[PDB]
Design a protein around this ligand. Sequence first.
Ligand SMILES: [Cl-]
Ligand SMILES: [Cl-]
Ligand SMILES: [Cl-]
Ligand SMILES: [Cl-]
Ligand SMILES: [Zn+2]
Length: 467
Amino acid sequence: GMFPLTEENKHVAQLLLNTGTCPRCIFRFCGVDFHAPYKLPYKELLNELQKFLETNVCNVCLGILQEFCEKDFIKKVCQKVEASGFEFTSLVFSVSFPPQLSVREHAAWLLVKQEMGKQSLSLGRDDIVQLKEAYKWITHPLFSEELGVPIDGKSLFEVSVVFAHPETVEDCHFLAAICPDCFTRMAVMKALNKIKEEDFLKQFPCPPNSPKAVCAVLEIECAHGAVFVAGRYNKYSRNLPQTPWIIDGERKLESSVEELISDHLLAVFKAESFNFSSSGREDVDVRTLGNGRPFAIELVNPHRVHFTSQEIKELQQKINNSSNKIQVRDLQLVTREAIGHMKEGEEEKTKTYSALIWTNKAIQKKDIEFLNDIKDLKIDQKTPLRVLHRRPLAVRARVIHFMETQYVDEHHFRLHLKTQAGTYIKEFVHGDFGRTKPNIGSLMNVTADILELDVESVDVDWPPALD
Ligand SMILES: [Cl-]
Ligand SMILES: [Cl-]
Ligand SMILES: [Cl-]
Ligand SMILES: [Cl-]
Ligand SMILES: [Zn+2]
């Protein structure tokens, strides 16, 4: 429109043109940082370039800044994207170029650096506009007009294009025969940084030669980042594991808390898989009552992500109508924070339990009264015998904050207790053959065992309780 190149740019510009470089790559090597000159029609660019200088696959980009950065190709990428059926309000654009492109870029650099030296001018390698940078300057607005959504670097919706050039693939192999301790684009980049110039020039043409064909499009793909649903679950079964318990391809028990919640969700979110996470866990024979235990489900590659509060509520009712073994409350869409909040709860927050306790010796109401007065009891708990195969042997210090008793009969009482995170309750009752000290048996001078255990509360405020 008014040509970006100065009289100073003529020599480099002419040499590059003469040896087969396209006008847009010529701008990059002249350090044109203005976006608009790159967006002009190829024909107008070539014709303005010619006019400037007197006043066909690019050997540098192999067509990337020729046909592949123009409207017709972007339209065909977007048509592919539209057929995939994702919901999205923005996109990030990811593009990958053949790793061998860096070799050609390096050769052009050496050529331009040499010409610059003739004119006693200085050029830095960082003065060259990167291929990918210029490529996105041109294509970003084209994607945006075609798809009707903004470009957002933090978008969970990604469109990716991979280019290949089979004809020149051996260049990657040629470079490994010079510095073997170095492909990826990045490992080629690393190698070219360390290669002696004379060694580069021995192996690779300078200027790079114009090839027979442009790059092939290897892949055009799109994907949506995971979305999360969180809530709390109650568990009413004493015969249900939290996650699938599979021994040899054989199920040890049927179903799980995880599956009873999640096996409704993949059809809803049109997602390919899920990862279930929770703030802690209870054993198969343990119920979780009261407000329940926080959980989150990560839904992978969801094709549907827009849901109102009412539609999520309806989802929760669907889960709840499907089982008596579990119930879900507080179901809500959340972000990746979920994982952090639940981990903190697991590691830091108190829990509350009710245990039905048996005693060998006949007890009276008055025999368990003293437990009600014990506050912040310090216990020394060796890794339980039943979990020595999973975790290493260690002595943890744990605190029983309070205990409240309800006498039942001469050989039973109920114990309500609040404990520090990570406390093994069953071992605190029966003592684990003295591997948990203090325990209910030692404190009472009986042998005690736990008949039933219920989690009464998991004292983790996250996810917010719903009205
Ligand atoms: Cl990228
Ligand atoms: Cl827990
Ligand atoms: Cl059921
Ligand atoms: Cl336990
Ligand atoms: Zn080019």
